[PDB]
Design an enzyme around this catalytic site. Structure first.
Site, short mmCIF file in Angstrom:
data_model
loop_
_atom_site.label_atom_id
_atom_site.label_comp_id
_atom_site.label_asym_id
_atom_site.label_seq_id
_atom_site.Cartn_x
_atom_site.Cartn_y
_atom_site.Cartn_z
N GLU A 33 0.79 -1.24 0.00
CA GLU A 33 0.00 0.00 0.00
C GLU A 33 0.82 1.29 0.00
O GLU A 33 0.72 2.10 0.92
CB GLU A 33 -1.01 -0.01 1.16
CG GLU A 33 -2.39 0.47 0.78
CD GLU A 33 -3.27 -0.67 0.32
OE1 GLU A 33 -3.62 -1.53 1.16
OE2 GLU A 33 -3.57 -0.73 -0.90
N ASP A 34 1.65 1.48 -1.03
CA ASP A 34 2.50 2.66 -1.20
C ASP A 34 3.65 2.86 -0.18
O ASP A 34 4.02 3.99 0.10
CB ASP A 34 1.66 3.94 -1.40
CG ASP A 34 0.94 4.02 -2.72
OD1 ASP A 34 1.62 4.01 -3.78
OD2 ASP A 34 -0.32 4.17 -2.71
#
Ligand SMILES: [Mg+2]
Ligand SMILES: [Zn+2]
Ligand SMILES: [Zn+2]
Ligand SMILES: [Zn+2]
Lengths: 107, 49, 45, 98, 59, 49, 1425, 183
Positions: free
Chosen positions: H3-4
């Site tokens: 997630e980034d």
DNA sequence: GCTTACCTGGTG
RNA sequence: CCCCC
DNA sequence: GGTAAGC
């Protein structure tokens, strides 16, 4: 019930409340052409008796104030010739339960 | 045949920020817009003095 | 004819440091110009 | 953009003086019923007069600028359809080299 | 001509077998995308079932 | 490596931001919306140098 | 809590009585007289003076000195003083009310201008609501401009009775700034009415009269709106910012008060002295100015009382005005202690409900623990540890109030704790804490987690919990709040715990699933091809915390024991878990490894992905939360990730450009595909260019051409798209993510590897921004794919400069919308919340607001909590009557239709049983009655509806539990089944009450559920399909009962906010623009955010009004019928049929100058006027479309002008259709007048306001004679404009079926009930068009709130905020100060029943855990010893 | 790195990858109050000065300034000044409460008026850590998630180890093809 | 039927 | 300001 | 700078 074609003169419209306990209702012929109660969106509205009303208020422990309201001029209130204070039971179809009944107090 | 002018370089259509992006013609439009705004949050050497 | 493109770039001007400074300098000089007229009115010489 | 620049603002007078010499009739002297065809000559949004052969005037102007005699920033457009020739000496115009 | 004129606008919609419907489970899907989120995250993709008539969304 | 084009005011470096405006001396025709009694307008925002 | 013991009894605020100060009260409550503008310096001596900024009113110097009270800074509320005003002044807030009161009373005698002797007045005096009553009295009395001595008597109109003399004429009062000017009646007497003048007549208003106006004898007399004695607020209200000794900056209020003072001293000096009287008026008006400008400094009357700085002076009113205001910024929201914020990071090694807390934060945040014999030793150790070691403590609070600071205390090393002392210790592992991610749009934006103190500076969270928060790890920051009571921490753990939020009641589905790495890895782990050998199998098993220690037998035993991925992942799945699926080509021997089959928490077949392990309504997550509980479910998230994550760390996963590189021959195919579509475009171009392209009902040859082009280029992107996606192998990393459902879609493959596609700006392909070209690089009039924005390359190939620019043009599109929408989308969110705030489910299952008004009699019509609702199939509703009968009918009296003796033991002896047949006859009759009713409710036949208790699963689970033998006869009886189900229905309780109202209400609530129940437990179904045993069937009935009860809403549910947030969050995601019908005008719709505003604002002038007229039954299939009805409806003017109108000088009536009109004359003549002829030619086509003839048109002109105009016309078959007109000094110009009115306003045919009508062929689902639902299409007229009233009474339509997007118009014609029905339809349709889903009950509730008042009540400051709800609550939204002034003048009483009021008062609200009281029972307290 | 977020090579971080310098300059002037009433740059002491800061004045030289090269932390006094409002008042400058570093440059000069002017630059080295933000040139922004040392990191047979680990999930939906072609 | 008076996302 | 889904 | 409910 007075069913007039075009209009009732304001001079004549004055005489309307002049004879109590009898009540006069004026409906235009054009308005009555279609029965709005027959519509897809219009559910069954039922006039409650003074005693049935007394019970409704008792059973839900309500002030008349706390009931959902219906206007006196409401097309359905006019159809039933609902007086002020009269409660109407509304039976509608529900997508949640099968049937659902609401109540409206004519103000 | 009617050509009056020729473009010097089409890459001169971009500004200072979008000029730094490698292969911006290989990216989804908003990625380029987003990186344009981001290089401002970067750090390197702003001046030798 | 069709309505004018109120948003065509050719019909837009970008005012840089020059005209921006020119705007102040005009009102600032004209403020001093009228202040010089105050000295000349007060003048008994 | 990397190669764009903004017009600094030149003087219109040498262009106005050049135009009238090159066959532009004064706005007072214009007779609409005697030449409705005539191209309306505009400098910095000012109608100055009309021109009978706008094609030649347009070339004489472009080559004059390309030479250097009219500032490279001065813009000149010929709208054949509306019969108009727009000239901008004006400051604040975003321009690019080609 | 007047009877042709009186008929209202249709709008075809280009369909793909790629997506499959939820309710009718049919591959007659007509999508479109839009930047609903920030330029940091991607587009949205709004799918319509040209068969049953059902609408949905993506990341 | 410095580029200039900025000002030094009380020690801080100031950038005068290019301000986009509508050009002057230009004739523009616009249709005025249905609520208005005026159908169309011919406008000129005229100022001298 | 405001320090140091008070002997006074502590109570809570139950009521707020708003009023106005009598000047007598201001003097009574004053401590200091206040008389010097000077604030301080005793001559020069730095200490406060006997005049302003107190003696007395409070303190400064953090020196006790607060006048005798002598309490000091924190303890002392200030004390008010007063200033006596030299002349009375109007209060700004009441200037208008004063005008209105003067307009109602005789300006001389103080009597009310109207009374009981007037009939209209009697009607107003009857009005119960003071606010509405004053508005009525005013509307009446304003016009009354004489104080009548006598008026006609109640009986005799000829005779008169004396009312209350005076007879004086009243002025016409106009407001001139802060002045009130009158005009009595040669030219009128103009004079300014003095404050004293007004005050005096206000003092003379009868109690009966001012009580008839909104006023209160005790709390708010009208005379009090005029100021006389001004309260000076104490220093705490206007603090003097001290910049260290002999340097103090006083508040703006302090400065203003000094000006009021100075203006007052001035006036008092002139009043007392030789008053020049025209100087007095100046000092008077100045005082008025300052007093006005002190309370409100934003008056319409421009001069904005400035500070010498040029700043404008902060009015008291300004301090209260919302967002940053006192109410909004300090009371509704606060800055708070025990809080933390950092960057959030993700952690696979944290349980779903844990939160990784950096040590530094853990050592700062401190929970205060009470010294008890259970913690005495532990706390003693933390105190020893001090404030610097992790398990430590910061302060020790004694019995003796004051706190010991462990970092400084000389005794910190010592300290012998005592019971009852509080130890303020560091936040430690497992402490419940509130974690939040702003903007907090949901209940799930804030959830309770268990602390896990960890190194590094980030809050770490479980990846699955990312989605409810709507958080990512690109530097998002998150908030932490520490509960301080053993009571608040129980609220967090028992109500807001992350595992409790798994199923959202907004969408009625789970709101957390498996994501990213785990979702990708779970698909990969569970394919047939995936096998694991011992070594790893052991590490994999050891990773599951809950593992039983038992090594499962490998799927493959033979000379290499191998375990399958499925097999070992099944270890993470708890026992007793059953889940069945079936995707596309799925059979029990799934060939594709499709669908899903889990038997006793062991995977039988199919690959595990987004469908099984996502947040799907029947997913492994949902089933586990429901079948085992939140805690078992939360444990499952943990286990699945720990195993899958481990396996992936070891298998690996990646992506490269190789994954975008689609095959050589495929690229050839893709290139010829694009070129093939490009050809079709050129062909449709050359066709359009040679005027051969045909119209299209979706009008304009140009619009029509663009449709064909646009479509061809879209078909192209999608055909090329497939070619590539099909050609990539099952090994393509991009596809592997797309398959798992972890990331990306088909579009992503098409755009990256095949072709980007057509670029769109404003729903249309790139426009000619330049003159007849998109770029100067192209030619003029270029409509080629290239010129109008078609990107033909993939991101892999690269974009050409043009493509690059056009892609940028259409790129920007979204970013603009999101930037614009943001405020509008936000303010909608707030209004919904503020309108629904106070709605809560009461102990009587009723839905009520703060006033206790019923909104819904039973929550969401069914009385069920949305988190316990699942889409289920009501079988009975569909199919043929024949198939229904087959499925349900049991006939013991018929050999062929009896129950087979193989199905039940009773089977052989049940044949011919008349007594039991009477029972099965009931069963079938009810099932039929049910099918009939369901077909009434859901008209379209739609079978799938969200209902409580997933019956599919219960039966499914009963079968796997009791090992049901589908090849053995059942021990059940028909009575066991028939009567069994009947008894179950009696125990499905939503309401309880021993009366018919409640008992009927109960019967009703359960109606639809029972339909499902009966349809699923029919005798034939139970035996022949489910094959249940008595034991099994009993267990089923038992579970249905239990589950149903669990499903009912909980009294205390803050159902209002829930609904507001459930409609709010999807609104947040809608678009402003959309343009889905651009490129086709004469087809326009409002949609998205704008339509949501039109709705919530009950907007009268809506953008797209539209009637949808349904045809009369047996005429719905006839196109020609509909065309004629169209002609009868659409508003047809004379102008609509006219080609041109001319004026001629035709002097001879007998012989026309026009040779064409020769034939017209020879007619309307064969069987003194005007030489001026008005001649208009009509269009045959126009005339024919609307079924018109020359006679009908002529006669309409003949009736609109009567005997003024002479109308003659051409007959219906003459080549040219003409009408000739002649009038009956001048003549000429009055014919141009006649032609204008003629065109502009002559109705030929049609209904007004209906400006355009179109024919449509809507498909309609209706039952066939055979019973099955069948698509039976019909003609429909779709309008442009509304006149529901007239169109309804039109012959040949179905007036039972007519509709409008204008619910406001339905409300008017059909009633409030139909109004609500339409409003719901409208609200639903905006949310749903966006793709979005909101459970019914939320929208139901909003629509109900907007409706209970009898009409349509907008979710605006005008709508809901103007209702009978408590002042303080209404002031919290929008009209803050104005609300409070009106509250004061009308002496409003706030019962503090609303949430907002309890928040402002810092009291526990009657919400959720506050919806009841808790008492000690001494009786039981004794019994427990 | 889900997630980034991203995994960074701690070994690389040690060897100097992504380390930065951070400077912050504090300014002060001796204020003049009409007639000779002027502020003074000095190390004040509780012996009539009476409104002093909580941090150490101890790092200052008699000129009320720190010598460059000195270490400064917490809310330590970096610039010492008094106000003659009457005897003295404190006007000293503490280093930003949430900071620390080394005094880099101190300059004593004059404002156009003719009063003592002081600027004080403080230098610190910032080293890549767990919450630290990083991004490529393709709108591919993210924080560090965890940091692994060389041994724990995955390796090519050539012995090459990544400095950074970004997630495959970043690519498909974002369609950041230029990133892959750059690489 | 025109002029006024209210409003306009969240943190830092 | 300068940052955010 | 957009809507409506005042005069
Ligand atoms: Mg983010
Ligand atoms: Zn479908
Ligand atoms: Zn006190
Ligand atoms: Zn009177």
């Amino acid at each position: 019930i007075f069913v007039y074609q075009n209009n009732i003169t304001p001079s004549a419209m004055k005489l309307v409340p002049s004879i109590p306990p009898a009540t006069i209702e004026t409906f235009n012929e054009a308005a009555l052409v279609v029965n709005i109660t027959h519509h897809e969106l219009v559910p069954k509205h039922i006039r409650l008796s003074s005693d049935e009303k007394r019970e409704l208020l008792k059973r839900y422990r309500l002030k008349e104030s706390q009931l959902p309201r219906i206007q006196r001029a409401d097309p359905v209130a006019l159809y039933l010739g609902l007086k002020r204070g009269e409660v109407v039971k509304i039976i509608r179809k529900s997508e949640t339960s099968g049937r659902y009944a609401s109540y409206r107090i004519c103000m | 045949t009617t050509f009056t002018h020729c473009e010097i370089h089409p890459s001169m259509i971009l500004g200072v920020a979008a000029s730094i992006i490698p292969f911006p013609d290989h990216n989804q439009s908003p990625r380029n817009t987003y990186q344009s705004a981001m290089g401002k949050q970067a750090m390197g050497v702003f001046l030798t003095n | 004819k069709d309505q004018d493109d109120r948003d065509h770039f050719g019909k837009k001007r970008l005012d840089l440091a020059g005209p921006l400074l020119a705007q102040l300098f005009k009102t600032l000089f004209k403020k001093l110009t009228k202040d010089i007229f105050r000295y000349m009115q007060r003048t008994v010489e | 953009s990397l190669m764009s620049c903004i017009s600094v603002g030149t003087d219109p007078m040498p262009i106005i003086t050049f135009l009238s010499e090159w066959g532009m009739e004064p706005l007072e002297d214009y007779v609409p019923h005697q030449s409705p065809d005539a191209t309306r000559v505009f400098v910095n949004g000012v109608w100055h007069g009309v021109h009978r052969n706008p094609a030649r005037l347009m070339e004489t102007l472009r080559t004059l600028r390309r030479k250097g005699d009219i500032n490279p920033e001065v813009s000149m457009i010929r709208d054949i359809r509306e019969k108009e020739l727009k000239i901008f000496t004006d400051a604040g115009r975003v321009y690019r080299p080609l | 001509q007047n009877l042709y004129n009186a008929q209202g606008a249709t709008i075809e919609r280009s369909v793909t077998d790629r997506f499959t419907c939820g309710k009718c489970k049919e591959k007659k899907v007509s999508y479109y995308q839009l930047q609903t989120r920030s330029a940091a995250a991607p587009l949205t993709t709004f799918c319509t079932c040209e068969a049953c008539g059902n609408r949905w969304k993506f990341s | 490596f410095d580029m200039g084009g900025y000002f030094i005011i009380n020690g801080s470096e100031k950038v005068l931001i290019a301000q986009e405006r509508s050009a002057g001396n230009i004739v523009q025709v616009f249709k005025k919306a249905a609520p208005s009694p005026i159908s169309h307008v011919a406008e000129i925002r005229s100022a001298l140098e | 809590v405001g320090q140091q013991y008070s002997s006074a009894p502590l109570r809570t605020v139950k009521e707020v009585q708003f009023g106005l100060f009598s000047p007598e009260e201001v003097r009574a409550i004053s401590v200091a007289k206040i008389r010097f503008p000077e604030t301080m310096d005793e001559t020069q001596t730095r200490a406060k003076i006997g005049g302003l900024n107190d003696p007395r009113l409070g303190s400064i110097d953090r020196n006790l000195k607060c006048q005798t009270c002598q309490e000091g800074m924190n303890e002392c509320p200030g004390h008010f003083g007063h200033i006596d005003l030299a002349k009375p002044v109007f209060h700004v807030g009441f200037i208008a009310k004063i005008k209105k009161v003067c307009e109602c009373v005789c300006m001389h005698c103080g009597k009310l201008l109207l009374d009981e002797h007037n009939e209209l007045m009697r009607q107003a005096l009857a009005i119960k609501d003071s606010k509405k009553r004053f508005a009525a009295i005013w509307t009446l009395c304003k016009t009354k401009m004489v104080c009548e001595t006598d008026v006609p008597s109640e009986d005799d109109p000829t005779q008169l009775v004396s009312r209350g003399g005076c007879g004086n004429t009243q002025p016409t009062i106009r407001k001139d700034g802060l002045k009130l000017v009158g005009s009595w009646k040669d030219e009128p007497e103009l004079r300014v009415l003095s404050t004293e003048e007004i005050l005096n007549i206000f003092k003379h208003i009868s109690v009966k009269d001012f009580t008839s106006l909104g006023f209160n004898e005790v709390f708010s007399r009208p005379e009090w709106m005029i100021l006389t004695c001004l309260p000076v607020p104490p220093p705490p209200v206007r603090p003097s910012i001290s910049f260290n000794e002999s340097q103090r900056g006083e508040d703006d209020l302090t400065f203003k008060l000094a000006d009021i003072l100075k203006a007052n001293i001035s006036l008092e000096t002139l009043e007392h002295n030789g008053a020049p009287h025209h100087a007095i008026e100046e000092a008077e008006s100045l005082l008025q100015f300052h007093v006005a400008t002190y309370m409100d400094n934003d008056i319409a009357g421009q001069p904005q009382a400035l500070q010498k700085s040029g700043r404008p002076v902060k009015s008291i009113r300004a301090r209260l005005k919302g967002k940053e205001g006192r109410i909004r910024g300090n009371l509704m929201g606060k800055r708070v202690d025990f809080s933390a914020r950092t960057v959030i990071s993700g952690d696979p090694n944290l349980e779903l409900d844990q939160v990784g807390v950096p040590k530094s934060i853990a050592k700062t945040l401190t929970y205060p623990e009470v010294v008890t014999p259970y913690n005495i030793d532990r706390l003693t150790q933390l105190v020893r540890n001090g404030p610097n070691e992790h398990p430590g403590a910061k302060y020790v609070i004694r019995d003796s109030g004051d706190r010991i600071d462990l970092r400084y205390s000389k005794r910190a090393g010592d300290i012998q704790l005592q019971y009852g002392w509080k130890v303020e210790r560091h936040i430690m592992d497992n402490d419940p804490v509130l974690f939040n991610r702003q903007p907090s749009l949901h209940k799930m934006s804030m959830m309770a987690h268990r602390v896990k103190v960890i190194p590094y500076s980030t809050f770490r969270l479980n990846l699955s919990v990312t989605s409810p928060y709507n958080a990512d790890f690109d530097g998002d920051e998150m908030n932490l709040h520490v509960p301080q009571s053993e009571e608040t921490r129980a609220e967090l753990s028992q109500l807001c715990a992350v595992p409790l939020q798994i199923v959202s009641p907004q969408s009625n589905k789970p709101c957390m699933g498996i994501v990213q790495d785990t979702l990708c890895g779970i698909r990969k782990l569970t394919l047939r091809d995936t096998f694991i050998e011992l070594d790893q199998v052991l590490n994999m098993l050891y990773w599951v915390p809950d593992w039983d220690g038992v090594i499962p037998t490998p799927a493959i035993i033979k000379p290499k024991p191998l375990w399958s991925g499925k097999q070992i992942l099944s270890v993470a799945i708890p026992n007793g878990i059953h889940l069945q699926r079936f995707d596309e080509g799925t059979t029990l021997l799934s060939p594709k490894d499709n669908g899903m089959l889990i038997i006793d928490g062991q995977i039988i077949f199919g690959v595990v992905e987004k469908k099984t392990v996502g947040s799907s309504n029947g997913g492994l997550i949902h089933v586990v939360t429901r079948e085992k509980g939140p805690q078992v479910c939360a444990k499952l998230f943990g286990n699945i990730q720990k195993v899958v994550n481990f396996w992936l760390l070891h298998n690996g996963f990646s992506t490269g450009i190789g994954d975008t590189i689609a095959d050589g021959p495929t690229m050839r195919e893709i290139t010829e595909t694009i070129a093939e579509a490009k050809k079709k475009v050129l062909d449709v171009t050359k066709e359009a260019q040679a005027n051969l392209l045909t119209a299209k009902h979706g009008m304009t040859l140009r619009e029509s051409f663009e449709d064909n082009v646009v479509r061809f280029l879209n078909e192209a992107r999608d055909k090329a798209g497939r070619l590539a996606e099909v050609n990539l192998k099952d090994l393509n990393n991009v596809k592997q993510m797309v398959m798992a459902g972890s990331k990306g879609s088909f579009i992503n493959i098409a755009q990256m590897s095949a072709c980007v596609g057509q670029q769109s700006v404003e729903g249309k392909r790139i426009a000619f921004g330049f003159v007849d070209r998109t770029l100067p690089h192209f030619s003029k009039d270029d409509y080629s794919p290239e010129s109008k924005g078609f990107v033909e390359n993939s991101y892999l190939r690269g974009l050409t400069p043009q493509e690059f620019f056009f892609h940028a043009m259409g790129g920007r599109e979204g970013l603009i919308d999101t930037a614009v929408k943001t405020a509008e989308t936000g303010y909608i969110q707030r209004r919904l919340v503020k309108a629904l705030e106070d709605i809560m489910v009461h102990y009587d299952n009723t839905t009520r607001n703060s006033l206790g008004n019923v909104i819904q009699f039973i929550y969401g019509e069914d009385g069920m909590d949305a988190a316990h609702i699942e889409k289920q199939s009501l079988d009975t509703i569909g199919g043929s009557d024949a198939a229904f009968e087959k499925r349900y009918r049991v006939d013991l009296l018929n050999t062929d239709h009896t129950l087979d003796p193989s199905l039940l033991e009773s089977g052989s002896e049940i044949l011919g049983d008349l007594k039991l047949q009477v029972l099965l006859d009931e069963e079938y009759k009810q099932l039929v009655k049910d099918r009939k009713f369901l077909r009434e409710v859901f008209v379209d036949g739609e079978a799938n509806w969200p209902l409580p208790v997933n019956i599919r699963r219960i039966i499914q689970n009963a079968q796997q539990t009791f090992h049901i033998d589908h090849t053995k006869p059942s021990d059940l009886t028909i009575k066991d089944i028939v009567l069994g189900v009947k008894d179950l229905q009696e125990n499905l309780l939503v309401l309880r009450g021993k009366n018919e109202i409640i008992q009927n209400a109960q019967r009703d609530a359960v109606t639809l559920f029972c339909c499902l129940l009966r349809s699923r437990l029919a005798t034939r179904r139970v035996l022949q399909e489910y094959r249940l045993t008595k034991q099994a069937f009993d267990w089923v009935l038992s579970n249905i009962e239990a589950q149903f009860l669990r499903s009912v809403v909980h009294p205390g549910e803050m159902v209002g906010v829930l609904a507001a947030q459930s409609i709010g969050e999807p609104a947040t995601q809608m678009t402003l623009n959309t343009f889905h019908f651009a490129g086709v005008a004469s087809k326009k719709v409002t949609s998205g955010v704008p339509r949501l505003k039109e709705i919530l604002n009950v907007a009268k002038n809506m953008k797209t009004p539209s009637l949808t007229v349904y045809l009369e039954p047996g005429h719905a299939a006839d196109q020609e019928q509909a065309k004629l009805i169209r002609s009868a409806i659409e508003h047809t003017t004379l102008k609509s049929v006219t080609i041109a109108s001319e004026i001629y000088y035709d002097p001879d009536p007998r012989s026309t100058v026009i040779p064409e009109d020769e034939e017209i004359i020879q007619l309307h003549f064969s069987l003194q006027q005007s030489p001026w002829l008005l001649r208009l030619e009509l269009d045959r086509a126009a005339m024919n479309d609307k079924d018109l003839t020359m006679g009908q048109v002529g006669e309409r002109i003949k009736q609109t002008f009567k005997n003024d105009l002479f109308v003659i016309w051409s007959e219906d078959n003459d080549e040219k259709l003409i009408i000739r007109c002649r009038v009956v000094a001048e003549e000429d110009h009055m014919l141009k007048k006649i032609e204008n009115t003629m065109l502009e306003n002559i109705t030929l045919r049609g209904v007004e306001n209906i400006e355009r009508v179109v024919m449509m062929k809507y498909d309609r689902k209706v039952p066939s004679p055979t019973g099955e639902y069948v698509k039976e299409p019909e003609w429909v007229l779709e309008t442009d404009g509304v006149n529901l009233s007239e169109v309804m009474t039109v012959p040949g339509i179905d007036p039972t079926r007519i509709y409008t997007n204008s619910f406001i118009d339905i409300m008017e014609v059909l009633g409030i009930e139909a109004g609500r029905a339409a409003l719901y339809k409208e609200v639903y349709n905006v949310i749903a068009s966006d793709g979005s889903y909101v459970n019914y009950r939320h929208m139901a509730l909003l629509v109900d709130v907007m409706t209970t008042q009898g009409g349509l009540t907008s979710v605006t400051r005008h709508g809901f905020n103007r209702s009978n709800t408590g002042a303080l609550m209404r002031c919290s939204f929008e009209e803050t100060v104005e609300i409070l002034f009106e509250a004061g003048a009308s002496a409003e009483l706030d019962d503090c029943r609303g949430v907002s009021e309890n928040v402002i008062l810092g009291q526990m609200a009657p919400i959720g855990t506050g919806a009841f009281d808790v008492m000690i029972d001494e009786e039981s307290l004794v019994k427990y010893m | 790195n889900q997630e980034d977020s991203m995994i960074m090579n701690q070994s690389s971080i040690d060897r100097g990858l992504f380390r930065s310098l951070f400077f912050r300059s504090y300014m002060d002037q001796e204020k003049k109050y009409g007639m000779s009433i002027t502020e003074t740059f000095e190390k004040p002491q509780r012996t009539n000065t009476l409104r002093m800061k909580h941090g150490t004045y101890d790092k200052l030289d008699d000129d009320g300034l720190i010598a460059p090269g000195v270490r400064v932390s917490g809310e330590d006094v970096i610039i010492g000044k008094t106000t003659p409002i009457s005897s003295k008042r404190d006007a000293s400058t503490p280093l930003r409460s949430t900071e620390n570093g080394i005094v880099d440059q101190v300059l004593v000069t004059t404002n156009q008026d003719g009063l003592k002017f002081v600027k004080v630059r403080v230098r610190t080295t910032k080293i890549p850590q767990i919450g630290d933000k990083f991004a490529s040139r393709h709108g591919q922004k993210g924080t560090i998630g965890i940091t692994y040392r060389r041994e724990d990191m995955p390796f090519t047979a050539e012995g090459i180890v990544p400095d950074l680990i970004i997630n495959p999930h970043a690519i498909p939906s974002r369609m950041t093809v230029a990133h892959l072609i750059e690489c």
